[PDB]
Design a protein around this ligand. Structure first.
Ligand SMILES: *C[C@H](O)C(=O)N1CCN(c2nc(OC[C@@]34CCCN3C[C@H](F)C4)nc3c(F)c(-c4cccc5ccc(F)c(C#C)c45)ncc23)CC1
Ligand SMILES: Nc1nc2c(ncn2[C@@H]2O[C@H](COP(=O)(O)OP(=O)(O)O)[C@@H](O)[C@H]2O)c(=O)[nH]1
Ligand SMILES: [Mg+2]
Length: 169
């Protein structure tokens, strides 16, 4: 099958692991160990194509090294996650995109911006604000809830679609 290497990035606590485990296992994990970084695979059919998703759930220590860069560089698309009730995690998005552009050495990298925890009532980041930022980046924006599973498949499948478009260009 066709493999897609996805990398889930974003601040501590935004829901990277919860989103990943929701997609793979269809259940919601609270308080998942923030130090554990793993890759998860799933075979899925997206727009008629059988896909093997290989999803890196980034975690643990913020590390910069030639080795780490090399590893990140193998990522084909990046799910850039913030939490809609945490403004700092949203303003961190610039940094993550900066590092992605740096290691991929391109201003064109498949990316999807994800505003997670959209089930919560105490939003601090407006949907429109994130939409406008995503538009400036030229990437899709989707709000998700790893808790209710709202748009979780949409978020990951949108990233696959972005990678497919990049490959065809
Ligand atoms: C909670 C738990 O420890 C956790 O999940 N994480 C996630 C990974 N990790 C991390 N953080 C940051 O930015 C954190 C920030 C706050 C303190 C200082 N620092 C700078 C900003 F102010 C925000 N950044 C990165 C990071 F860039 C990378 C990484 C390293 C090398 C290259 C690349 C290339 C592309 C990438 F997408 C990433 C990513 C992610 C790269 N890695 C991990 C980071 C905090 C702990
Ligand atoms: N209400 C709500 N809580 C979430 C959601 N996603 C993650 N969480 C909670 O936020 C905390 C951090 O999530 P986690 O997946 O560990 O974040 P990570 O550090 O980015 O991997 C956990 O307690 C989760 O239960 C969500 O969509 N809604
Ligand atoms: Mg985690």
């Amino acid at each position: 099958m066709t493999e897609y290497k996805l990398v889930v990035v974003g601040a501590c606590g935004v829901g990277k692991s919860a989103l990943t485990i929701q997609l793979i296992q269809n259940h919601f994990v609270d308080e998942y160990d923030p130090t554990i970084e793993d890759s998860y695979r799933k075979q899925v059919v997206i727009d008629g194509e059988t896909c093997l998703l290989d999803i890196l759930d980034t975690a643990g220590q913020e590390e910069y090294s030639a080795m780490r860069d090399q590893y990140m560089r193998t990522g084909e698309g990046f799910l850039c996650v913030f939490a809609i009730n945490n403004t700092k995690s949203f303003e961190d998005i610039h940094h993550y995109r900066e590092q992605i552009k740096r290691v991929k050495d391109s201003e064109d990298v498949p990316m999807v911006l994800v505003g997670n925890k959209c089930d919560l009532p105490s939003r601090t980041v407006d949907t429109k604000q994130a939409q406008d930022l995503a538009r400036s980046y030229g990437i899709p924006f989707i709000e998700t809830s790893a808790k209710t599973r709202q748009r979780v498949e949409d978020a990951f499948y949108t990233l696959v679609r972005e990678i497919r478009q990049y490959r065809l260009k």
